[PDB]
Design a protein around this ligand. Sequence first.
Ligand SMILES: Nc1nc2c(ncn2[C@@H]2O[C@H](COP(=O)(O)OP(=O)(O)CP(=O)(O)O)[C@@H](O)[C@H]2O)c(=O)[nH]1
Ligand SMILES: [Cl-]
Ligand SMILES: [Mg+2]
Length: 723
Amino acid sequence: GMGRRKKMVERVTTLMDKPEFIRNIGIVAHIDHGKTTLSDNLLAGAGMISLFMDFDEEEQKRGITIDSANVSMVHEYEGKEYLINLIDTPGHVDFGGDVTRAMRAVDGAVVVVDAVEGAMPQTETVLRQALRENVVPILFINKVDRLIMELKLTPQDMQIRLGAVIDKINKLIKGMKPDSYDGLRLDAAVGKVAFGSALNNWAISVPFMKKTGIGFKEVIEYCMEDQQQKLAERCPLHAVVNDMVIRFLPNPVQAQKERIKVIWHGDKGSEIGKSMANVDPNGKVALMITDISTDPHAGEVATGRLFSGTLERGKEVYISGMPNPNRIQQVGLFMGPERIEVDRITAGNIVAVTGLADAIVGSTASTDKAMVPFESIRHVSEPVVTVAVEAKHMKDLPKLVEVLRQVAKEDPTLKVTINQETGEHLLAGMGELHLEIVAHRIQRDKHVEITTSKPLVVYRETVSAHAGPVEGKSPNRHNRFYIEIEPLQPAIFELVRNGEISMKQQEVERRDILMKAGMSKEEAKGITHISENNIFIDMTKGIQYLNETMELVLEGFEEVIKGGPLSREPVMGLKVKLMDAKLHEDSINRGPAQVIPASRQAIQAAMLMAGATLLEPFQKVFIHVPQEQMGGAMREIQGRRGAILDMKTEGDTTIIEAKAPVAQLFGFAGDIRSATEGRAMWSTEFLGFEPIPANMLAETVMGIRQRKGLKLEMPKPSDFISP
Ligand SMILES: Nc1nc2c(ncn2[C@@H]2O[C@H](COP(=O)(O)OP(=O)(O)CP(=O)(O)O)[C@@H](O)[C@H]2O)c(=O)[nH]1
Ligand SMILES: [Cl-]
Ligand SMILES: [Mg+2]
């Protein structure tokens, strides 16, 4: 009934124009805590369908969510209908990029937590990703049936266990956002927490129990008596959870002004800032592109969040960084399960658009070319595992290049390196599963048979000392650049890594952040380029033509950051300082082909003078094992160059927290299973890049150079600079 496609078309299209009645939400959780069962049962309970959501063949075969999925529901609350745009997100750490992209589109998050496992490593990760986006969280504690049936827990004890979960989530919130904790605090008594069984279609909350005249003792009886279906009639999952969504997650009128504080360095008082804050359909277009996907019938689809304005077929918008207007072909919304085309979409909605040929993940699409773009969408960690990929058949060579480029466009937590001169392309990602799924879907969906090499790690290059000034010279000798280099301080690197500083911020705003983190006032005032992991500082004054030349100097800097001089691995942790410069007065002698090499070579040589070295990625590993198998678990992790960071005993089980190099964790799944007779449960989180041992530098570098087909000799500064 309510979910009839044409009755939902009319109901959604009516609600679409009423931002008060919209809720843009993501469902987020540690792996297997029940996101998709919840999403599926909300859709079913709400009438939108008759697990549906895991559409991909591999998601059903593996019982894992691989891609974010967009659906919507219409839900009545206090005699009014509301449009709930829902994004179900992957739990596995390898697909975390989908969580980060989903979080940019939504204003509220249902954090799902398993009552049995409690808060887990990615519970913290997704909560942090929500709070960094100014997304409001509520809590659904799931699998309460198991808590009741497998632990036979009494009304008072089950309560104590559920309360501990709530307190833990609140502690995480308070630690992440101390200044907004009071507003964000989860209170079971008002109803910001619900508890239930997504699998069995029931849920309760403290206020709902105090009104249904139902107690927790009755819930235990329903489960013990194998009458959970009768419980689902009295305490419907969709009614309790969707009510909580409407009552506690924000509409776009409430949320957009909060979202733009963190996703946009523009002025909230500018014309576009006010239109976005007011969710104005008659403002100019401001569209945040969060996802690129490929449709069988429609072609490429750009999904995103429309903050201001109205979109319709034929309307033209600029794409940030690109010169020409792109023309919308179709616009669509998610209506229950289905992405349906509509005549026009308005601010406040999550939208799907075709025709934006230049759009990428993170693009700003706008009516005015000059609009300040939204911030990039940055994932919590970067690629650490790589394989070589090659077509099995010479007729598929050009197609494989298009396929790999499209794969990385659709998931920028992958990094593709095309080689059209050998065909041995490189694919880097977050983990082995990440790359296994990509390879499978190339063969299945794109019909290109491929080989992949054994996985290897991706290192990072950095420096470990100060060097300079070092002079780089243009090929015509007319232009000179004098560079000093040193490692970033940890607190500064964190600001850069977290995007807390930006060249888009007011100079005063940015410099105060840097100085409070320990940077001197001249370096803070001189910062001119903040890359993803490195900074460039201009210490000069009065050098004529330098401002117009600085973009070329920074291009040379970016070229080095893509692959450092030790082994062509990505560079991180650099503070590069321009101390002096000499420029020819005529622009014909200081164009890109003159200035870019001069900047690049000075930085390359300075790195080799500054104790250049390699960093290797480490994972944090969390191993939950019964006491009987703790010896095998400890031995397995310590045999892989692992170090134990913590051991916590809870009952007759131990939670081991350890760290180990990614390069030492291949085959861990099978080895930890046999070492513990299948009893270990384990998860991971990326820890960071750490310095390789000093007496392994030459051999590590030579091995990388060998793998890449580079010169079999250690680089030296004279390879880059000459008299
Ligand atoms: N007993 C019980 N099992 C549940 C409940 N909710 C989900 N499950 C079970 O947990 C497993 C995972 O459920 P699923 O909904 O796919 O979780 P998910 O968090 O989406 C998995 P991913 O992180 O890969 O996306 C399934 O076997 C499912 O039936 C519940 O309320 N009770
Ligand atoms: Cl610094
Ligand atoms: Mg799922």
